Design a protein around this ligand. Sequence first.
Ligand SMILES: *[C@@H]1O[C@H](CO)[C@@H](O[C@@H]2O[C@H](CO)[C@@H](O[C@@H]3O[C@H](CO[C@H]4O[C@H](CO)[C@@H](O)[C@H](O[C@H]5O[C@H](CO)[C@@H](O)[C@H](O)[C@@H]5O[C@H]5O[C@H](CO)[C@@H](O)[C@H](O)[C@@H]5O)[C@@H]4O)[C@@H](O)[C@H](O[C@H]4O[C@H](CO)[C@@H](O)[C@H](O)[C@@H]4O[C@H]4O[C@H](CO)[C@@H](O)[C@H](O)[C@@H]4O)[C@@H]3O)[C@H](O)[C@H]2NC(C)=O)[C@H](O)[C@H]1NC(C)=O
Ligand SMILES: Cn1c(-c2cnc(OC3CCOCC3)c(C3CC3)c2)n[nH]c1=O
Ligand SMILES: [Ca+2]
Ligand SMILES: [Cl-]
Ligand code: NA
Ligand code: NA
Ligand SMILES: [Zn+2]
Length: 805
Amino acid sequence: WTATSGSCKGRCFELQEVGPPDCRCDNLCKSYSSCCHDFDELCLKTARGWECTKDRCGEVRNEENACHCSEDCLSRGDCCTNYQVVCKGESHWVDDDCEEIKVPECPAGFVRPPLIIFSVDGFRASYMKKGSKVMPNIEKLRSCGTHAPYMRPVYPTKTFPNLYTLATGLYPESHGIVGNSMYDPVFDASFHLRGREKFNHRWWGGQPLWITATKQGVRAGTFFWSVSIPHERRILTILQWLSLPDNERPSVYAFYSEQPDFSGHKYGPFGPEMTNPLREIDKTVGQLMDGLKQLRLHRCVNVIFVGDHGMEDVTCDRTEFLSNYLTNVDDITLVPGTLGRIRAKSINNSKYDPKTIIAALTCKKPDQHFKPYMKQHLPKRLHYANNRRIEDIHLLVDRRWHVARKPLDVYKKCFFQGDHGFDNKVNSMQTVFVGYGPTFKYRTKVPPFENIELYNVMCDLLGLKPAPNNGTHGSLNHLLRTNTFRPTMPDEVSRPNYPGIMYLQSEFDLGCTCDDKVENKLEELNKRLHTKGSTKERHLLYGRPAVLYRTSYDILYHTDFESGYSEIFLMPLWTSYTISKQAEVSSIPEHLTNCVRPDVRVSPGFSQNCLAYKNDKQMSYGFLFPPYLSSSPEAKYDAFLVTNMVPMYPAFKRVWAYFQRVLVKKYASERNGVNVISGPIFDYNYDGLRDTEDEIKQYVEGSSIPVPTHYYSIITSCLDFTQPADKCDGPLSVSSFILPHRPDNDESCNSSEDESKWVEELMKMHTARVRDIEHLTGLDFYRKTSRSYSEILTLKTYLHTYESE
Ligand SMILES: *[C@@H]1O[C@H](CO)[C@@H](O[C@@H]2O[C@H](CO)[C@@H](O[C@@H]3O[C@H](CO[C@H]4O[C@H](CO)[C@@H](O)[C@H](O[C@H]5O[C@H](CO)[C@@H](O)[C@H](O)[C@@H]5O[C@H]5O[C@H](CO)[C@@H](O)[C@H](O)[C@@H]5O)[C@@H]4O)[C@@H](O)[C@H](O[C@H]4O[C@H](CO)[C@@H](O)[C@H](O)[C@@H]4O[C@H]4O[C@H](CO)[C@@H](O)[C@H](O)[C@@H]4O)[C@@H]3O)[C@H](O)[C@H]2NC(C)=O)[C@H](O)[C@H]1NC(C)=O
Ligand SMILES: Cn1c(-c2cnc(OC3CCOCC3)c(C3CC3)c2)n[nH]c1=O
Ligand SMILES: [Ca+2]
Ligand SMILES: [Cl-]
Ligand code: NA
Ligand code: NA
Ligand SMILES: [Zn+2]
């Protein structure tokens, strides 16, 4: 109950919300049916429209008008945004040449440049080029400021997950807004777009920018606008707030546009009906910039123009129905559309089985347009698993398609021609970023980057210390003229041992055998120097990775590769090797097919054993440095060391062998040499973070050898591919992957065919950032390069997406 009989007089768009049942006059009151009786009359004035005309100039202040063209309007802060243009011979902001903003040029009393966040729903990245003729204000922001060709949203590429990621710097799994629709089993409660539950604070985790600012004594504009308040009124309200006295005036403001998303759903992303919504958004930008210019704030404010996600062509006829696959369709609940989430209809049904649901959904039709996953098997780059609100069973839906439970759900719910929500790598889901203002660079293009990074930069823009988040602070310093954040490399926690020869062959009883008892002063000083690290500068190009947690591990040198070997996990944490463009691929000699050799630098007690693999009928083994790329028949023996061995399911060995035999040489040829770092990952609790020993759920049978959940590789070369990887003088180029270590290849529907038809497609799907691998392993890479640390942070956040242009 609200006693809606108080008044909004003098209170219109008040900045602190009042506690029921006193009536409200803030920009959100409509959404709560809590505005005072007189809110529309006082606060939502529309008389005479939104623009000064010739004959309104100098007029007598009529307070009924939506905006004013009288003489006192400038000092009142409530002129129509085109006042000075109509009545003072001034030019529109878009018609002025842009001039570099070297320093903030602000009115007296401003302690920092204000930040205005202008967010647009469904603004697909290619609108910047394709709609440029009809968006002159936006094009001026873009070309005069700092811009990215596109900005990558988070998954799912839905509105609320992405806006809240923008606000928090957190993945949806961490902030808790994991879709536009959700069930939380602990609350036993549901979140929906329509309705009241979404207002309850328990849905909304992390610390959004407005709370960060408030806690640190930076005043924030109430960010959110009830939908019926028109755009013109939102802009005028922001401009009025910017006229408050210094002690009351916010330093950060937000504008949100429901367009072009609203129309994009109805007409598709490039429907001829889409020109008008784009023109209208540009006009709103024009009104803000003209308004700032009137207030002499146009060279003082930092403006961010940012989208939440793009929009793809999707129609009712491109719907797959679970009723075409499942006999038991009534025993499941589906969250439907551009992603699928499945759980049991009733928790009292003990006959429901996710195993059989997944199987009935796997590779059942030749051109099936969704793929089912247990959430912990989704590509790690999605970071979409560690939340009780994310159902165990997930469907990744092909772009341009929908999934529904039953055909009745679609024709009793063709309306729409656009939608979004798909894999955040998809080109049509990419969105926009432009930063314009004193703190951004002038006429600068920056590479594509992920929206999780922006919270840190908005904090930087406001002099705020960011709450802990998933951005990599410093990776976007290259957007900024000043206020950069100067991070330090994390300190190494564990230093390595460098073991020499300490064990005799006969101390090992690992049940391993090798055909290698075959016999020199020249070449014996040689093998010794290699084992002391003589070739190390060739194979470890960027320093050894730092171990950022407490553990016991050894560095092992070899002719062709270097590794950091964990005495706790009984395998390398990392193995580093360089493969030049000239390198040759050889095969494993026949006599060496099942060769495993004891490593006399590492005790039997800290070694794997071959008997455990023999006894484990499910588990086999592979090598991290591939024997195929050995530099000489003699160096090849190093590759069969028990300290280079890792457990591998036979089904995964198909993947791994093709990577090592075919793909590594292919990249070396294409990139003029590559450096490769590979290693195991353990993430049994699917939280994206390195597991401790006591979190490991699976061991090679009868042993203490832990089974990795994933294998990674980081493949670095010179960005200037005219220089070989091992002799590179400038910026680097990287691609990485985190392959799930699975006992079957059910994920790849064509896996009964030759690896040349399916493995590279699997690797692409599991593309990753170096930063993702750092979280998962507790390692820090690129410790010693000649590049600036900010530049290295950017490289560590790079994702190679394999989408076309
Ligand atoms: C992306 O960035 C984020 C932010 O940095 C990273 O997430 C952080 O990771 C930390 C490590 O996992 C984690 O630290 C834990 O904090 C626990 C206290 O948590 C509360 O307080 C914080 C701070 O205000 C708050 O943010 C949290 O909010 C979460 O929970 C509510 C709902 O419950 C949500 O509204 C909110 O969205 C958020 O949920 C997310 O995080 C939780 C995990 O905390 C997930 O479960 C959710 O699914 C969701 O993803 C909390 O309100 C603290 O209690 C933990 O301490 C335990 O472990 C330590 C090790 O130091 C041990 O010493 C302690 O004994 C303790 O163990 C005890 O509790 C155990 C569990 O019950 C029990 O098993 C033991 O036996 C002990 O009794 C821990 O330190 C931090 O909370 C989150 N922060 C956020 C915002 O999510 C994230 O990792 C990054 N992702 C990647 C890929 O890098
Ligand atoms: C969807 N929505 C909104 C709305 C607008 N902006 C938002 O976040 C932005 C605030 C500024 O920083 C950039 C993020 C949010 C987040 C989701 C809570 C919601 N308002 N009205 C409406 O329908
Ligand atoms: Ca983990
Ligand atoms: Cl959703
Ligand atoms: Na075996
Ligand atoms: Na298969
Ligand atoms: Zn939408």
